[PDB]
């Protein structure tokens, strides 16, 4: 595909605010393509990375990292307090068809919005 | 908060097939909870394992989707291959619910974008 401005919509707990993220090129070394959203500071912005690997099995890795912006007394430079790391990896085989991969992707997309997942992630309490 | 029968909606390239999954109990050794589909064969069943750690909380989700083909001359089918998926979430002690929900829904929304669907379906980068 060709990198374009991905406009995420109605995301969040309330599902009102939106973000738009644009690409940042591809890292020549290991091929991990990167995208980010403008936030007037290069280090305080939220970033996503995606990378598919060339073989025997195909491995796809997607990382998401966003900081928390805080500005306290004692200095005029906003400081990084805490990050939010996340990563999703797929390890499909070589003879897998498109139907299975689409099934897995859609299953992940639907399951993450299920009440069990939102209860386990938002309130950080395990299932019982 | 407790685990029970959760039914995923339409699923697939055109969202045709659907899967229903039921609890398989909680493993007391490491606290991982298992969810499985009723496929009439224990060997081949779409499996989802979810766990939440304790201290810098860590959320682990693993998906295993096996597919099998009947052997040549053997009546019982043997597993052919399987697709794996791993999702890890990391948060600090001071993370708020708004941030966690925002990250969750952002990850949910990214899988519907053209970039992710093209990358996963066709295994082609940019």
């Amino acid at each position, epitope marked *: 595909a060709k990198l374009e401005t991905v*406009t*995420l*919509g*109605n*995301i969040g707990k309330d*599902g009102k605010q*939106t973000l738009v993220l644009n690409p940042r090129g591809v890292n020549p070394t290991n091929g991990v393509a990167s995208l980010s959203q403008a936030g007037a500071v290069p280090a305080l912005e939220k970033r996503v990375t995606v990378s598919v690997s060339q073989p025997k099995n195909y491995k796809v890795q997607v990382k998401i990292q966003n900081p928390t912006a805080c500005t306290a007394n004692g200095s005029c430079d906003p400081s990084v307090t805490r990050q939010a790391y996340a990563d999703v990896t797929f390890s499909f085989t070589q003879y897998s068809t498109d139907e299975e991969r689409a099934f897995v992707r*859609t299953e992940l*997309a*639907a399951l993450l*919005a299920s009440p069990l997942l939102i209860d386990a992630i938002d309130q950080l309490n395990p299932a019982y | 908060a407790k685990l029970e029968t959760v*039914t995923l*909606g*339409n699923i697939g390239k*055109d*969202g*045709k097939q*659907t899967l*229903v999954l039921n609890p398989r109990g909680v493993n007391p050794t490491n606290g991982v909870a298992s969810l499985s589909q009723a496929g009439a064969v224990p060997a081949l069943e779409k499996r989802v394992t979810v766990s939440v750690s304790q201290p810098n909380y860590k959320v682990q989700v693993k998906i295993q989707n096996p597919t099998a083909c009947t052997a040549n001359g053997s009546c019982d089918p043997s597993v052919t291959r399987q697709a794996y998926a791993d999702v890890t979430f990391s948060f600090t002690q001071y993370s708020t619910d708004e941030e966690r929900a925002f990250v969750r*829904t952002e990850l*949910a*929304a990214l899988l*519907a*974008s*053209p970039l992710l*669907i*093209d990358a996963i379906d066709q295994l082609n980068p940019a």
Partner: antibody, heavy 115, light 98 residues
Framework: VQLVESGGGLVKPGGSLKLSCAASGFTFSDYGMYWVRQAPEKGLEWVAYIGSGSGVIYYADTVKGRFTISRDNGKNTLFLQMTSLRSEDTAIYYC????????????????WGQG | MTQSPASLSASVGETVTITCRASENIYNYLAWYQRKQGKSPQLLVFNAKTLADGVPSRFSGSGSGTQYSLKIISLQPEDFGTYYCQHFWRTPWTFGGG
């Protein structure tokens, strides 16, 4: 608010023809806009879905190649191209939207429009 | 590719009257849709038994797999219209009945 207009279709067993659903008093942006067919008696069925740049190919039967769908977001207007047409296709359609992002499970609300 | 018959009738008085039905494979992903012929249709109930905003309160709804019911106790006058029902589980969908 959520004022919805409709395009003009006045051609039967013939022509290509197009229909336009335009949103107003409402951000087009990300909401998944639906479609539907009425038909005069009895039969009335669901048709294709558009939620974002992708997810385009959710077509019902007899629609797989007969119809094509696209979304313009710079003007908050829908589009629909009709390749073939038979006695099946009537001239009364409606367009509706969705709560939020896709793969959640709520559908078909607020309609309004004509054909 | 499923089916969804309603098979109900009409009435004239409005104090308390009959509820609707539907039958297909299990799991409750449906809605009800008060269609007025002059105007466009509109939503009634979300997720089987949860009514949404801008609706009179006493339009009861309940059901489970293979069984659906919308109860209209404490009915208000001049609001008969015509109702339909759909399911959103598979791709093709039905969105039909009476």
């Amino acid at each position: 608010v959520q004022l919805v207009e409709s395009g003009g279709g006045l051609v039967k067993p013939g022509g290509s023809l197009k229909l336009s659903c335009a949103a107003s008093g409402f951000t087009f942006s990300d909401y998944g806009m639906y479609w539907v067919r009425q038909a005069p008696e009895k039969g009335l069925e669901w048709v294709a879905y558009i939620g974002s740049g992708s997810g385009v190919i959710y077509y019902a039967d007899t629609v797989k190649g007969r119809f094509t769908i696209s979304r313009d977001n710079g003007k908050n207007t829908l589009f629909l191209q009709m390749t073939s047409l038979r006695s099946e296709d009537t001239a009364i359609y409606y367009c509706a939207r969705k709560r939020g992002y896709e793969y959640d499970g709520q559908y078909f609300f607020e309609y309004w429009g004509q054909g | 590719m499923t089916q969804s018959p309603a098979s109900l009738s009409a009435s004239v008085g409005e104090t308390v009257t009959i509820t609707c039905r539907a039958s297909e494979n299990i799991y409750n992903y449906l809605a009800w849709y008060q269609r007025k012929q002059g105007k466009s249709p509109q939503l009634l109930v979300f997720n089987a038994k949860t009514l949404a905003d801008g609706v009179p309160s006493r339009f009861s709804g309940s059901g489970s797999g293979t069984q659906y019911s919308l109860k209209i106790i404490s009915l208000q006058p001049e609001d008969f219209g015509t109702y339909y029902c759909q399911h959103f589980w598979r791709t093709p969908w039905t969105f039909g009945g009476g």
